[PDB]
Amino acid sequence: DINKLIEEGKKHYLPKTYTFDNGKIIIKAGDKVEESKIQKLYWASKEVKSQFHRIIGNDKPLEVGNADDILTIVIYNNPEEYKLNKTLYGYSVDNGGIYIEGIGTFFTYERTPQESIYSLEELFRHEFTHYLQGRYLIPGLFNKGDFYKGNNGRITWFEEGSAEFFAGSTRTSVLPRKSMVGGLSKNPKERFNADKLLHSKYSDGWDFYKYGYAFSDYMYNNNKKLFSDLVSTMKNNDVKGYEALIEESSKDSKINKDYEYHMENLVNNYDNYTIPLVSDDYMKQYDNKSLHEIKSDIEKAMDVKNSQITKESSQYFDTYNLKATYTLSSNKGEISNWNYMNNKINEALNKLDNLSWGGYKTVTAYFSNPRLNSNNEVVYDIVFHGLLSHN
Ligand SMILES: [Ca+2]
Ligand SMILES: [Zn+2]
């Protein structure tokens, strides 16, 4: 059978397999892709994931039973061997990487600095965001859901721009990427305006990635309300609402002005930025700490009670998920509430970091899915994720 011939080709070029989160993440890699680097990628995914949920405000799969219930990651040794993915898997290789939502799989390759301005972790983080968008943000499958029907390129600027943006995720924020900021034109006149960006499409080329990235960072830092409203329409599959929002935003001269001002500030601070990558804290061996002890410290740190903590197994370590709810005593509106929760969660992470156990340096956390209880109070789901112990 032809299928047997293909798998032998896969096993040849991608002999190594690494599994995380009880098999929910499977990384197939070439022999030359470093084991330590792959482990780092897992932790990188958690930083992006937590920031993504904070901003998107949903951590529930939009559709249960989809192939992205398991995330498969394919990493080739180098750019040259990546081209074989077309024959082996059947997908386009004219890119740094690609995510195929239908099979919950994203493909990429290790590279030296000479071959690309982006590191593997950087591209990994970008591609991971597509997986997050597919699973939690955009209903239906890529190119098939309602957001793609009709005008196929309607969400493209945001889908790619936010993917670039979320690649700068850290444990507490989303920070600018030197590689993306450097791509922005030094001449203000040459930069995209909002209207141009908001109607960009794949056939336009690759420039809108950088400007979409810049607009995302603008929204996050200076227009959280627009970011929030955009993701709400997406989650609701409200295509008309999104389109109305795009038209209003494109023709808003103040939005364009503030967007261009944000880019100037980004370009001005170029030397201050670095490539956000995962710290060495994730690889270090730590003293064993009890699950009950971790739960207790996190409950104290976050001021939540009756939390549920669950251990999960990966290939070379165990991790935990702590689930809790937090009730906001005063509802002061979406953005003010957002900032309160973001600051509160970050304060919790800092408190845990300041504790003696070095394991707390691996913790990522988010808040999501706000709702009103009886008595009109804002209840948030709260999730903390961290290393339990290396094997
Ligand atoms: Ca989807
Ligand atoms: Zn992309």
Author numbering: 340 to 730
Q: What do the authors say?
A:
Clostridia employ collagenases for nutrition (e.g. saprophytic strains) and host colonization (1–3). They are large multidomain proteins of ∼115 kDa belonging to the gluzincin superfamily of metalloproteases.
As described analogously for ColG, inhibitor binding induced a 2-Å contraction of these segments in ColT. This conformational breathing emphasizes the hingelike active site topology in clostridial collagenases. Although all peptidases adopted an open conformation in the unliganded apo-form and a more compact conformation in the complexed state, this breathing movement was most pronounced in ColG and least pronounced in ColH. Notably, the peptidase domain of ColG from C. histolyticum showed a higher structural similarity to ColT from C. tetani than to ColH from C. histolyticum. This structural relation is in particular evidenced by the extent of peptidase half-domain motions accompanying inhibitor binding and may, on a functional level, reflect the substrate specificities of the three homologous collagenases. The interaction areas between the inhibitor isoamylphosphonyl-GPA with the individual enzymes is largest in ColH (256 Å2) > ColT (248 Å2) > ColG (220 Å2), as calculated using the PISA server. The characteristic HEXXH consensus sequence is located on the central helix; the third proteinaceous zinc ligand is a glutamate located 28 residues (ColG and ColH) or 30 residues (ColT) downstream on the neighboring gluzincin helix. The spatial arrangement of the zinc ligands is identical in all three peptidases, notwithstanding the difference in sequential separation.
